[PDB]
Design a protein around this ligand. Structure first.
Ligand SMILES: *[C@@H]1O[C@H](CO)[C@@H](O)[C@H](O)[C@H]1NC(C)=O
Ligand SMILES: *[C@@H]1O[C@H](CO)[C@@H](O)[C@H](O)[C@H]1NC(C)=O
Ligand SMILES: *[C@@H]1O[C@H](CO)[C@@H](O)[C@H](O)[C@H]1NC(C)=O
Lengths: 119, 281, 184, 146, 36
């Protein structure tokens, strides 16, 4: 999946984290302007209390984006689907399935072989 | 089949019957060929850096020594800021550059560990859930097949548990399968071999036994013979020859993220603690 | 690419299926594996007539005892060893340095040797059935059969720690000399 | 009875100097029966074999004690001199067909019962009667972990 | 800087006012492309 594969609440969670770190930065500046959100976005995507909080938030953001990239890479790697048959020897062919329709044409040599190997 | 053998109506009979204590007293059978028994069939740190503190202390000490060396060349206004910037998002810049390289290597190793990581409920009758099914709001309706070795065993072991299971007793096999599929019963008690076969041929493989080796009473199948029948020796010798020639194996074959929440909670707690410390100071 | 090359070409340590392992079908001298003696393993090997010569080449000797065989395997003298699953798994539980690999084949249980004319066969069988019925045998088995982030990453972490401490130690005197030269 | 030394079931070790075997307790605070099991001092062939008393215990001996208590039997555990299971083998110069080890001891009448982790086999059952198995298993492959 | 500033920022965001939202989402697209 191009977008988030599962647990799509991560966007809301990171938005809430941005809001709380922004209000905390505002409080720290008051006890030392619509720019905290811009700083958070710049921290997320490259383009004493205040700096420490900003750098901790940047570390958390880079850890989160690294985890997201790793999850995307793992999901891309996981594809499987090796035709789900791999020759005659397969559980799907052993027990007939109504959903998966497969047969021969008519009473041909394949049909004779199937009848001869009656199992 | 046992009744048929008792009245001399069938000298030799095999029906995949389970070996039982009372059966040997009345009739006799050869050595078992397939193992079976009683089975139960039911329907940041964890991701990477499990030790965590082991490398965290090393990171702390190397950061402290780097800060001291930079001061020898502000301890918190400059050295700490630079060190945290090496992980965020003059001649004194050489140590900064090499520490940033170390941080990049650490990040790559963390991503590699994440990629490598990405790429039962009960252990038997020992748990109190079977002994005390009423400890939970949903009743632990087990259910068993009557007229069977499993119900004989539960009768011989626990009377109260047998009564509780008979409170939800059904025919089983097909009824047990449909109850498990529809969620009527949390788990079912029956022969180990039958449960293993059903798990092997389960729709979606959602039903499986409790691992392996947790059989309450491991027994076999054997072949029932008449008392005093002069066929026990031949039967056992032939069966042992078959299982030693690979016939038994041949017959058996071809027949049957969360860490994100912990991380965000940890970072929120750290931010709150830092804010409180700064407010106090 | 480094991550890909690390995840591939790993040290899987093939779980050696045994009777179905293609690499065991070729009796390579570089991979030696044999039983102890003429016991049930050798009986099964002789009974299996399709690859009797292959089994004979695999053995190539008879070990004095299972304890000596396990000691040789622990000392890496023998690449693989074949014996009863219960003994191997008990040894693995005792020492995690030995691992059990492969599925279950030739599932033949144990027994008690007795004369045919001895009238205690029925008593022994009934007693064994009673023990299997009661929890005494189960508890005895539990007591007697049930017992109890990587080296490479730790090593590379130690190596990079040594490298960084050496680098800062040398850069300290380097910067001291640079400052002395600048401020003569 | 003749028993083969196997670590999971038969913990063979020399007895204490007092002439008996010291008694210990398991993890759950229960004593473990340790009967005196006389046998050869050295298992290596061509050695001065001596019938010194050894102490052997484990699960098989506990099952044997339970059987003895249920059927009023007695225990006479003795280690096999050959130190092997002793299955069918080809004797030197094609003399005759016979059995060694525990099977040969049972056939010779020296021991009338075998309590050892011996699996059920066709040729073993041809001449020696076997009771119902007390545990079911299938031999596997052992490889050093690395 | 018109020509210089915009292109310089676009190339800078490849590696690691109200218009900040647009450059932020463009950098998000760039990092998604890099991850892919
Ligand atoms: C035996 O089977 C009958 C029906 O076939 C059933 O009514 C009865 O309850 C069974 N016996 C026991 C002990 O459950
Ligand atoms: C046990 O042995 C005694 C005497 O040999 C015999 O009378 C009794 O029937 C036996 N019991 C069983 C369950 O085999
Ligand atoms: C056990 O059997 C022996 C037979 O020698 C007998 O003397 C003894 O009284 C029996 N013990 C019990 C408790 O039945």
């Amino acid at each position: 999946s191009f977008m988030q594969p599962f647990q799509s609440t991560l966007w809301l969670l990171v938005g809430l984290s941005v809001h709380v770190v922004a209000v905390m930065l505002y409080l720290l500046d008051r006890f030392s302007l619509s720019s905290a959100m811009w700083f958070s976005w710049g921290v997320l995507l490259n383009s004493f209390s205040a700096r420490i909080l900003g750098m901790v938030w940047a570390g958390f953001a880079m850890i989160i984006v690294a985890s997201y990239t790793a999850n995307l890479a793992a999901f891309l790697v996981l594809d499987r689907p090796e035709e789900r048959i791999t020759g005659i020897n397969d559980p799907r062919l052993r027990n007939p399935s109504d959903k998966f329709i497969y047969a021969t044409v008519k009473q041909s040599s394949v049909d004779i072989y199937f009848r001869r190997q009656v199992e | 089949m046992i009744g048929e053998v008792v009245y001399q109506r069938a000298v030799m009979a095999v029906g995949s019957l389970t070996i039982n204590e009372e059966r040997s007293e009345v009739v006799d059978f050869s050595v078992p060929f397939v193992e079976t028994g009683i089975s139960v069939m039911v329907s940041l740190e964890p991701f990477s850096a499990s030790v965590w503190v082991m490398m965290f202390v090393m990171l702390l000490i190397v950061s402290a020594i780097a800060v001291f060396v930079f001061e020898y060349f502000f301890t918190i206004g400059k050295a700490i800021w630079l060190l945290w910037g090496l992980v965020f998002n003059t001649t004194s810049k050489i140590m900064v550059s090499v520490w940033a390289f170390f941080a990049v290597i650490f990040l790559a190793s963390y991503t590699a560990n994440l990629a490598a990581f990405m790429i039962d409920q009960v252990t038997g009758l020992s748990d109190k859930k079977f002994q005390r099914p009423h400890d939970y709001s949903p009743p632990f309706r087990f259910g068993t097949v009557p007229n069977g070795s499993t119900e004989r065993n539960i009768r011989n072991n626990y009377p109260y548990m047998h009564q509780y299971m008979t409170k939800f007793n059904q025919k089983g096999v097909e009824d047990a399968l449909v109850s498990l599929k529809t969620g009527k019963l949390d788990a079912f008690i029956y022969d180990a071999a039958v449960l293993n076969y059903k798990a092997g041929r389960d729709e979606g493989c959602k039903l499986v036994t409790i691992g392996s080796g947790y059989i309450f009473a491991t027994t076999g199948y054997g072949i029932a013979l008449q008392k005093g029948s002069p066929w026990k020796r031949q039967i056992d010798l032939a069966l042992l020859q078959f299982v030693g020639d690979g016939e038994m194996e041949e017959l058996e074959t071809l027949w049957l993220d969360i860490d994100n929440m912990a991380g965000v909670f940890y970072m929120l707690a750290a931010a709150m603690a830092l804010s409180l410390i700064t407010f106090i100071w | 690419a480094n991550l890909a090359a690390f995840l591939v070409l790993d040290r899987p340590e093939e779980r050696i299926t045994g009777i179905n392992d293609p690499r065991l079908r070729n009796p390579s001298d570089k991979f030696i594996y044999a039983t102890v003696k003429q016991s049930s393993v050798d009986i099964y090997f002789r009974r299996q007539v399709e690859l009797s010569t292959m089994y004979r080449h695999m053995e190539k000797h008879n070990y004095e005892s299972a304890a000596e065989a396990i000691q040789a395997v622990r000392d890496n003298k023998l690449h693989a060893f074949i014996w009863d699953s219960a003994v191997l798994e008990f040894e693995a539980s005792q020492k995690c340095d030995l691992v059990t690999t492969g599925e279950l084949f030739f599932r033949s249980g144990f027994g008690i040797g007795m004369r045919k004319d001895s009238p205690w066969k029925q008593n022994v069988s009934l007693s064994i059935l009673k023990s299997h019925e009661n929890g005494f045998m189960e508890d005895l088995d539990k007591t007697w059969v049930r017992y109890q982030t990587f080296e490479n990453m730790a090593g590379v972490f130690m190596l990079v720690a040594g490298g960084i401490v050496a680098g800062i130690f040398l850069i300290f005197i380097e910067i001291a000399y640079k400052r002395h030269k600048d401020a003569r | 009875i003749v028993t083969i030394h196997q670590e999971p079931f038969v913990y063979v070790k020399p007895t204490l100097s007092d002439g008996t075997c010291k008694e210990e307790f398991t993890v759950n605070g229960d004593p473990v029966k340790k009967v005196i099991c006389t046998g050869p001092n050295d298992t290596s062939p061509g050695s001065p074999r001596h019938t010194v008393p050894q102490c052997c215990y484990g699960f098989c001996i506990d099952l044997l004690i339970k059987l003895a208590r249920t059927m009023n039997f007695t225990y006479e555990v003795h280690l096999v001199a050959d130190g092997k299971f002793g299955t069918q083998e080809r004797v030197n110069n094609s003399n005759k067909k016979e059995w060694n080890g525990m099977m040969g001891e049972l056939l010779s009448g020296q021991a009338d019962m075998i309590v050892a982790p011996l699996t059920i086999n066709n040729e073993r059952a041809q001449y020696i009667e076997f009771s119902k198995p007390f545990k079911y298993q299938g031999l596997t492959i052992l490889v050093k972990k690395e």
